[PDB]
């Protein structure tokens, strides 16, 4: 009852991607993202639950203060209403060579907070802390908020105090964790381009949505997973919910006679 209406709702996500909205910023480093992988990303997501993907890219030769998001890696994840359960291993592949980790991208069911949320601050921080390769070249968290018929993009970098609090947020997971502040994340200028195409990276098995496979997620989250260059599968794809397609045991024969004639 819950998921079925959500699956049919995914169909109108493509109309959402066509009309996007990027939040401007009055500040005093620029990031560019190829529309192709972003539109495909929005279409792949769910209407109610968060979907995430690691960011990789590099700075062009002409401009070293600009970094292009060359790839979006899909990892085995269990979506949440306000959070996302990510693994503690990075994707290794030949396609990522010459590229650098640039945070992660995820969508938001409810409307966006004009500040870096405690969830994004905690996940981004602990991802920066746990992974050595993650902290050096500055990374950011990109949120793709959903508004009926539109999409709002925001880019938040992690502040020093935000990092110290995020990792140290041992626990309170909530909308107002003890110690949280609206000034733990500063926004970054994000831009969209149709000049170049970015590529994708999904798990070699092909399955990244372990929501309908939560029992199987625990047996891979703390292990190194292979990644292959391919196209990402939809959230409610058949592979993500193979249990739904499992055959019952109702009568397999057919008590109605009719000739096909077409052999």
């Amino acid at each position: 009852t819950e998921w079925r209406t959500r699956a049919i709702a995914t169909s109108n996500l493509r109309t959402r991607a066509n009309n996007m909205y990027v939040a401007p910023v009055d500040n005093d480093i620029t990031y560019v993202m190829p529309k192709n992988i972003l539109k495909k990303f929005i279409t792949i997501a769910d209407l109610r639950v968060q979907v995430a993907g690691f960011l990789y890219g590099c700075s062009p030769a002409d401009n070293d203060q600009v970094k292009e998001i060359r790839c979006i890696v899909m990892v085995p994840q269990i979506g949440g209403n306000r959070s996302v359960q990510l693994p503690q291993h990075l994707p290794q592949h030949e396609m990522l060579k010459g590229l650098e980790p640039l945070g992660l991208i995820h969508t938001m069911a409810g409307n966006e907070l004009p500040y870096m949320s405690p969830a994004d601050v905690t996940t981004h921080a602990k991802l920066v802390d746990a992974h050595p390769s993650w902290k050096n070249q500055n990374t950011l968290t990109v949120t793709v908020a959903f508004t009926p018929g539109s999409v709002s993009l925001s880019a938040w970098a992690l502040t020093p105090l935000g990092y110290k609090w995020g990792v140290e947020n041992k626990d309170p997971n909530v909308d107002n964790p003890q110690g949280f502040t609206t000034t733990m994340g500063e926004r970054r200028q994000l831009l969209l381009s149709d000049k170049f195409k970015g590529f994708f990276l999904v798990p070699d098995t092909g399955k990244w949505n372990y929501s309908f496979m939560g029992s199987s997620f625990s047996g891979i989250e703390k292990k190194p997973y292979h990644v292959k260059l391919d196209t990402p599968l939809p959230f409610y794809s058949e592979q993500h919910r193979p249990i739904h397609f499992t055959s019952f045991n109702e009568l397999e024969d057919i008590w109605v006679d009719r000739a096909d004639n077409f052999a």
């Binding site: 049919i8 192709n36 010459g98 292959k228 391919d230 109702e250 057919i254 109605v256």
Partner: protein, 1702 residues
């Protein structure tokens, strides 16, 4: 009768026959005399007494011995035929006319059809050569599968002695056409045969059908009728239009309008049509028609039950007989039987008590009830029975036998038993006449064909004289069945229903291109004849009384039908012109049998961004399910069902759409369905999904939508194999238990972890010790493809890619058949669009072979802002979860440098000829004042500066005069230095030679322009003999190899290189080599030398110009559209996966294209194969025959040309030229060629059809040049390689004859996915890269010999002067260079040279690599250098030889040569080939040229008569002698040896090993040598002594009379005294010349009528295993012992006469 314009538009829906199958067009129901009617409470009864015909008036049966001995076999069981077959016999066996027999069911009608087959066997049988199994096909069409299977059974067993194999057309196996080509007397259903012919994939075999039998042809009345009409119509359509005889036989039931059906089959009434009334029925039939009068439903059903009950008492109690009752439902057969038993228990022990008498009721009923597994056998022991398709084979067979035994008194069964086996249970009852049809989605009345077959199965023929058929329906339906069981129900046509789709199918096959063609096609239907005899009944309109042949009516019909086809975008239709042309959408609709409305919704709803749920939605919106309603009686069941299906359908709620969607899902997921109407509708959706999904599949495919197409394909596999894509693939294995499948689907394991493993390690992987052994076999047989792709940036705009597909599984005919189909998909980075796709077949032969590496070449577009990667996927077409995907990264790819704009053509003065400063040179072209514009822009550097110049203009631009302006200037100066011109092929060198030789014989300066032949002995000084020479890149390679020590090789100031772009064409590397050195030549001598190069418009001329060293000022590259005569190009994309079927398909369009663009102008048609020239010419003439103007392309009466009757050596060309066509191919004789060129240019013939292999040799030109096909079959790799761009340019270069428009026109017919490849490089210049790096060793092995490659580092320098080096920097990735920088480039050269030279190290050629791995040319490489033998062949020449030469093995060694592998290999010439092996002595690959060369040489040995195409025999002869003369030079070393010199002796004179030498003399047939043997004429010496005047006892009286030859015997005597030479060469210690002459005053190479186109080698001595020793010889020798023996003689090629005197 031609009338084009229509006057009234009509609505087809308004004319369609509602009540179709149940149509009753008779207002009168004639009834038998004894007909009576009784009335009862609730129902009526009409009894009809049976006719009697025991007294057959004036006829009996014909004896089986009447037939010939070869046709009396299959009638084994019967000692004589039947009178039903007796009257038909004379026409059925002794005439080839169409037939139509109307006889009662079970009267032995099949025997009549067998005569028609046996007669066709007679046309294919002779006293000798009988049992011809590959020259005829027979088609038997049955309405149902149960019939085709039984007819396959008896025909197969009865025709067994004939060795002919019967089969039923079905499934994908024969969808892959294997069984249609291998089996004869093919049996199938109407739909399957129609869809098979619609696809036209097997058109090559469909032309072999001489006979077609239509059983149950009265099915025309049913909705399936239009299928029979669509078949018979098109058949007779061409059968009487083209002339090709096709016989049609009709097997129908006794019904009205049989005369109309007769005229429909074009049958002669007097001898063709026969009618047998019910009196000819096996057993007389008494008919009961019971009509229930109850109004309400429930009361009717109960009434029927009671009536069936009471009838059971009267037909088993009153008169004890078996009782077959038919019902229309599985679950009903049990209820009806149970009701009869249960309700019978009014203590009515009767029949129950009466059947109990024997010990049977105590046993068999009890004994049989326990053995079987079928439940509901609670009523079996009561003498009741049940028979439906749901029954197991064991149970149904038991019931059938028990009933035949008589142990079953009452058998209730469905229609399955009515069409399956034969029971005739005496009395038959049909309880109710209502059935549910999911199609119409309602409760329609029973089908008449079902009724006839039911009641037709009446009383026992031999046991009963009484046939009692009882039919229980409703009172309102009585008159219908009375009209059916009494020959009253007329057979009408339902064509109006499927008229639109039938016309669509006819337009797709090309059988209908015009509206008049549609009217013509409609004239051969059954609807047409019924409209003729019954204008009012079919409502013609009465407006067509003045319409003679109902043409205007047919025009209005075809118009409206084409209109709806036009508005649906199925066909492209012009209203007023009348012409039509089917589109790609219409093709799919025809190939899968789908309505136009359904196709319309698909084309308007399917978009690239669709998912799974939406695709299911579009599926449910099909027009085939628009009648299926959602009844409230089942809504509660669907709701709970809709909320548990895999794919959410919640978008639709309680609509017919949601029902159809949930049904298809339910069937796949196996859900619960209880409603009878529900289960019926689900089955209908299931049996339609298979074709619906594939239709959407090809729609997504042709629109290039990757994601959607892949989803559609998975759905196809879903419905076909019945499973979800995530289910266990083991379901696709019939021989697989359900237990392991059930266990597998509960395993959290991917399908990827099943492969490459042993049974043990898999047993615990799936948790079953038992399946460990079997599962490993199943997975191993699963189609697994491992691919490896290599990319080559052909252009900065387009990408060329080479795909290598290698099978990774084991074959099983049960699961794979003979061929496995695949799909090659290439997606972009997004994977949203398809950049390329094409079907990939995989035959069992190539797959099983040790070397199974399959390769396929194709191209794909590229955006300069190149995306990260592409996607190449190879997917199975029928197997699910059998995909092989490969990411094609581009981060390594480096695009070639951009191309500068072509040298724009400036508009200056025309520059008249007088500007040359001479009037004598004006004789060049006297007719026209100013010459071609191209040279008016290049002349100022052409005949001025003596530096290099390169011109690049399109073919036929007025191109060759460029070099002329280079020679005219060069030969107008003092001390005219010698010159040399080089064309790519011999065809071109002697073509422009024949022009410049005779047209330019003027010696004023230039004189004696000679043509290089090849032999170095004559050309070495013929170059010094003449002022200029024309040669090929090959003979200019062997010659001038050493440049330092030659006389005239330096003085060449002017060197011409025509068609330099062909350097990239195969064997063009030899062109690149010679051109590369020549530039290096003029550098060392410091002398000034010009090298002009002529070629087509090139993409980049910067590298070629620098290759010749010419600055930008004098380098001209024009756009490929500055051609003087504008080329109007027309491309036609064709979508057919069969090469042959594609050629016949293009036959029509080519005939049209010629008549559209060149009605008064000449036209040429290029064809892939030499053989295809004869066929295409034949298909073209037949096309003219169909339009009724066969001599369309003949513009003069045959009498003016008939003088060239037998002057044409080839018969096919004579018949073709007889109607105004004619062709041209390489196997054509020069004589025939002269006749063609004369008859073409003189305007006798209008169209020519040349081969592709003759594109260069062809001196012809025309207004329209069509390119039929762009692929040729290469037997080397067993593929269909695409045309080289160079060819298409040359072939269109023949279209230089402009029209009144002033613009030439050409058409290019190619496969669909090859369009944007040819259309691109035809709009822009031609790009070409060298292929030297592939064939380096060939270039090296020759270069090593010329003392220029002793260092190998000079090879580094040598490469620099090659076009290969210049391009490697500009386009690195193309060749394999991964590092653009210099150090990386030199690194690549170092690796390659040390790799290829290493290849020459592994094979017998110098090796050492110390103080430089430097190498001097070895013996093998040396001889290979002068004769240009491939090292691949020479590596084959060194390995095979053994301790003993063994002779005849060397001939195998000769045929193992690689030079023969490049031979044309037409597929179906294997039969005759193997036959020649049966007529010749002596593990060869059959399809290989190796075996073909071996056999053809065998033929040359016996001088066997070979077919025209086997001129390949001549090809092998031409080059082998020079190659074999090297084979002996190679075998000079080691021991023996020189047997090949005897072998060369064999081939030169066409002789055997050591047969009579008289075979060499003119004539002298093998019988004449017998006449020579009986007399003293053994060898020729005694022949000449037995021929001369005074001797041979003066003809031994007369010997010349004993010899067959009389006159012209001097030609034989001439060879003996004059041609056959005489010896003149004459024969010094224990240890430490003269001249040929005879007679006198003699000037005479060799007598060679057998062969198309030396004095050195001698040998000596022998001991034990023998050795060798090849103005005397200096033969200095160190030896142990002493000896003296023989020396040999010359004779490089002469039969016998080989002295070995010591």
């Amino acid at each position: 009768v031609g009338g084009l314009q229509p006057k009234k538009l009509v609505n087809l829906e308004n004319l369609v026959f509602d009540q179709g199958n149940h149509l009753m067009t008779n207002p009168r129901v004639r009834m038998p005399e004894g007909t009576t009617k009784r009335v009862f409470k609730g129902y009526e009864e009409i009894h009809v007494p049976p006719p009697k015909k025991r007294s057959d008036p004036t006829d009996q049966n014909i004896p089986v011995t009447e037939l010939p001995e070869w046709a009396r076999i299959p009638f084994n069981t019967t000692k004589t035929l039947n009178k039903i077959q007796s009257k038909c016999f004379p026409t059925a066996f002794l005439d080839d006319g169409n037939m139509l027999v109307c006889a009662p069911t079970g009267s032995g009608k099949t025997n009549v059809a067998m005569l028609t087959m046996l007669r066709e066997i007679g046309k294919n049988r002779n006293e000798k050569g009988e049992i011809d199994l590959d020259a005829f096909k027979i088609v038997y069409i049955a309405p149902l599968k149960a019939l085709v299977q039984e007819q396959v059974g008896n025909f197969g067993k009865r025709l067994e002695p004939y060795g002919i194999k019967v089969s039923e057309l079905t499934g994908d196996r024969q969808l892959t056409k294997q069984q249609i080509s291998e089996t004869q007397v093919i049996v199938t259903t109407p739909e399957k045969w129609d869809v098979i012919t619609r696809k036209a994939t097997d058109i090559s075999y469909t032309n072999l059908v001489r006979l077609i039998i239509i059983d149950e042809i009265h099915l025309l009345h049913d909705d399936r009728g239009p299928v029979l009409e669509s078949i018979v119509s098109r058949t007779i359509r061409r059968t009487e239009q083209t002339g090709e005889p096709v016989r049609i036989i009709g097997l129908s039931a006794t019904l009205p309008n049989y005369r109309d059906v007769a005229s429909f089959l074009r049958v002669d009434f007097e001898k063709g049509l026969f009618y047998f009334d019910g009196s000819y029925r096996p057993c007389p039939l008494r008919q009961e028609f019971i009509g229930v009068t109850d109004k309400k439903a429930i009361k009717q059903l109960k009434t029927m039950n009671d009536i069936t009950y009471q009838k059971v008492l009267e037909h088993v109690g009153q008169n004890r007989n078996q009782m077959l009752i038919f019902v229309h439902s599985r679950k009903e057969t049990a209820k009806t039987a149970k009701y009869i038993r249960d309700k019978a228990l009014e203590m009515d022990t009767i029949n129950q008590i009466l059947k109990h008498d024997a010990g049977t009721r105590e046993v068999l009923q009890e004994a049989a009830s326990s053995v079987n597994n079928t439940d509901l056998k609670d009523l079996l022991p009561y003498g009741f029975g049940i028979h439906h398709a749901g029954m197991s084979r064991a149970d149904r067979t038991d019931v059938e036998d028990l009933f035949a035994s008589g142990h079953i008194q009452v058998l209730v069964c469905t229609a399955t038993l009515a069409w399956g086996v034969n029971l005739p249970a005496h009395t038959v009852i049909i309880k109710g006449t209502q059935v549910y049809s999911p199609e119409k989605g309602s409760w329609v009345e029973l089908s008449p064909q079902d009724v006839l077959q039911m009641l037709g199965r009446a009383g026992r023929p031999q046991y009963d004289t009484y046939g009692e058929g009882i039919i229980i329906t409703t009172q309102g339906e009585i008159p219908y069945y009375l009209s059916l069981l009494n020959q009253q129900l007329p057979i009408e046509s339902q064509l109006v229903s499927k008229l639109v789709d039938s016309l669509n199918a006819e337009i797709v096959l090309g059988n209908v291109r015009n509206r008049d063609e549609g009217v013509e096609w409609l004239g051969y239907t059954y609807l047409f004849v019924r409209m003729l005899r019954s204008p009012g009944l079919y409502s013609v309109g009465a407006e067509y009384e003045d319409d003679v042949a109902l043409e205007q009516k047919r025009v209005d019909l075809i118009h409206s039908a084409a209109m709806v086809l036009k508005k649906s975008n199925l066909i492209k239709y012009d209203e007023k012109t009348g012409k039509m042309q089917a589109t790609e959408l219409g093709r799919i609709a025809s190939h899968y049998y789908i309505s136009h409305e359904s196709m319309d919704t698909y084309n308007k709803l399917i978009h690239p961004a669709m998912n799974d749920v939406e695709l299911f939605r579009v599926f449910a919106q099909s027009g085939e399910f628009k009648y299926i309603p959602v009844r409230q009686e089942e809504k509660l069941e669907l709701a709970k069902l809709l909320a548990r299906v895999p794919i959410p359908v919640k978008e639709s709620i309680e609509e017919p759409t949601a029902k159809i969607n949930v049904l298809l899902q339910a069937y796949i997921s196996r859900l619960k369905l209880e409603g009878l109407a529900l289960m019926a509708d689900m089955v209908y959706v299931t049996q339609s999904a298979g074709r619906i999904l594939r239709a959407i599949f090809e729609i997504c495919l042709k629109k290039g939508w990757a994601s959607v197409a892949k989803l559609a394909l998975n759905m196809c596999k879903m419905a076909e194999k019945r499973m979800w894509p995530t289910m266990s693939p083991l379901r696709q294995y019939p021989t697989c238990p359900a237990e392991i499948i059930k266990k597998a689907e509960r395993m959290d394991v991917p399908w990827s972890s099943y492969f490459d493993l042993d049974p043990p390690r898999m047993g615990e992987l799936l948790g079953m010790p038992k399946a460990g052994k079997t599962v490993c076999a199943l997975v191993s047989k699963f189609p697994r493809v491992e691919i490896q792709g290599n990319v080559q940036p052909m252009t900065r705009s387009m990408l060329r890619i080479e795909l290598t597909i290698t099978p990774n599984f084991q074959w099983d005919v049960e699961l794979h058949g003979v061929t496995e189909s695949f799909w090659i998909l290439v997606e972009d980075c997004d994977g949203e669009e398809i950049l390329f796709h094409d079907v990939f077949i995989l035959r069992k032969d190539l797959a099983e072979a040790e070397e199974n590496e399959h390769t396929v070449e194709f191209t794909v577009p590229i955006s300069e802002p190149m995306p990260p990667n592409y996607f190449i996927s190879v997917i199975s077409d029928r197997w699910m979860h059998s995909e092989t995907r490969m990411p094609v990264s581009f981060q390594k790819l480096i695009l070639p440098e951009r191309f500068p704009p072509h040298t724009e053509l400036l508009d200056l003065q025309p520059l008249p000829v007088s500007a040359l400063k001479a009037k004598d040179y004006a004789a060049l072209y006297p007719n026209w004042q100013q010459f071609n514009k191209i040279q008016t822009q290049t002349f100022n550097s052409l005949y001025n500066t003596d530096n290099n110049v390169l011109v690049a203009a399109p073919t036929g631009s007025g191109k060759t005069v460029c070099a002329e302006f280079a020679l005219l200037r060069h030969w107008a100066k003092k001390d005219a230095g010698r010159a040399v011109y080089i064309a790519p092929f011999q065809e071109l060198v002697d073509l422009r030679f024949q022009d410049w030789q005779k047209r330019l014989s003027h010696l004023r300066g230039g004189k004696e322009i000679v043509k290089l032949t090849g032999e170095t002995t004559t050309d070495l000084k013929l170059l010094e003999q003449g002022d200029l020479i024309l040669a090929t890149p090959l003979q200019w390679d062997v010659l001038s190899r050493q440049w330092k020590r030659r006389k005239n090789v330096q003085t060449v100031e002017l060197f011409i290189a025509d068609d330099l772009h062909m350097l990239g064409g195969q064997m063009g590397y030899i062109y690149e080599i010679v051109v590369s050195r020549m530039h290096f030549i003029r550098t060392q001598t410091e002398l000034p030398m010009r090298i002009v190069g002529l070629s087509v418009s090139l993409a980049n001329a910067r590298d070629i110009g620098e290759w010749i060293d010419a600055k930008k000022h004098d380098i001209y590259n024009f756009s490929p559209h500055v051609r003087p005569v504008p080329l109007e190009l027309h491309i036609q994309s064709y979508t057919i996966p069969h090469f042959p079927s594609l050629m016949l398909a293009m036959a029509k369009p080519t005939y049209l294209a010629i008549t559209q663009l060149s009605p008064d102008q000449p036209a040429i048609v290029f064809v892939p194969s030499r053989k295809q020239t004869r066929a295409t010419a034949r298909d073209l003439l037949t096309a003219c025959l169909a339009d009724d103007d066969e001599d369309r392309f003949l513009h003069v009466e045959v009498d003016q040309i008939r003088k060239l009757l037998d002057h044409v050596q080839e018969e096919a060309l004579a018949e073709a030229l007889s109607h105004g066509v004619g062709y041209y191919h390489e196997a054509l004789s020069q004589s025939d060629k002269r006749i063609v060129k004369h008859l073409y240019n003189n305007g006798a013939i209008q169209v020519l059809i040349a081969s592709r292999d003759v594109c260069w040799e062809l001196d012809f030109t025309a207004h329209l040049v069509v390119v039929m096909g762009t692929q040729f079959f290469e037997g080397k790799e067993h593929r269909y390689i695409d045309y080289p761009l160079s060819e298409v340019l040359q072939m269109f270069g023949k279209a230089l004859q402009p029209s009144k428009d002033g613009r030439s026109r050409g058409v290019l017919m190619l496969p669909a996915v090859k369009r944007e490849y040819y259309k691109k490089f035809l709009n822009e210049a031609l790009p070409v890269e060298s292929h030297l790096h592939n064939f380096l060793p060939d270039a090296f092995v020759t270069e090593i010999s010329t003392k220029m490659i002793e260092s190998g580092e000079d090879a580094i320098n040598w490469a620099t002067f090659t076009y290969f080096y210049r391009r490697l920097l500009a386009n690195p990735s193309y060749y394999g260079l991964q590092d653009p920088t210099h150090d990386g480039l030199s690194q690549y050269l170092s690796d390659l040279v040390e790799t290829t030279l290493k290849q020459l190290s592994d094979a017998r050629i110098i090796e050492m690599d110390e103080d430089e791995g430097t190498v001097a040319p070895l013996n093998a490489a040396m001889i290979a250098a002068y004769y240009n033998i491939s090292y691949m062949t020479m590596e084959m020449f060194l390995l095979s030889l053994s301790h003993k030469s063994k002779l005849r093995t060397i001939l195998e060694i000769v045929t193992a040569a690689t030079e023969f592998e490049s031979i044309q290999t037409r597929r179906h010439e294997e039969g005759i080939l193997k036959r020649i092996y049966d007529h010749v002595p002596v593990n060869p690959v059959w399809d290989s040229a190796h075996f073909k060369a071996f056999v053809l040489v065998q033929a040359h040995f016996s001088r066997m008569n070979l077919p025209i195409d086997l001129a390949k025999d001549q090809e092998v002869i031409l080059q082998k002698i020079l190659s074999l003369l090297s084979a002996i030079v190679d075998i000079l070393s080691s021991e023996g040896a020189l047997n090949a010199m005897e072998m060369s002796q064999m081939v030169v004179q066409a002789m055997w090993d050591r047969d009579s030498p008289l075979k060499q003399i003119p004539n002298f047939t093998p019988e004449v040598v017998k006449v020579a043997n009986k007399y003293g004429i053994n060898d020729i010496f005694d022949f000449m002594e037995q021929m001369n005047p005074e001797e041979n006892p003066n003809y031994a009286s007369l010997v010349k009379d004993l010899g067959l030859t009389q006159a012209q015997l001097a030609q034989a005597a001439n060879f003996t005294n004059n041609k056959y030479p005489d010896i003149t060469l004459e024969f010094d210690n224990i240890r430490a010349h003269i001249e040929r002459e005879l007679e006198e005053d003699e000037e005479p190479t060799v007598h060679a009528p057998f062969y198309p186109g030396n004095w050195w080698l001698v040998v000596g001595e022998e001991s034990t295993k023998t050795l060798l020793a090849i103005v005397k010889l200096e033969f200095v020798v160190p030896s142990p012992g002493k000896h003296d023996l023989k020396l040999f003689l010359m004779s490089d090629s002469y039969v016998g006469v080989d002295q070995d005197p010591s």
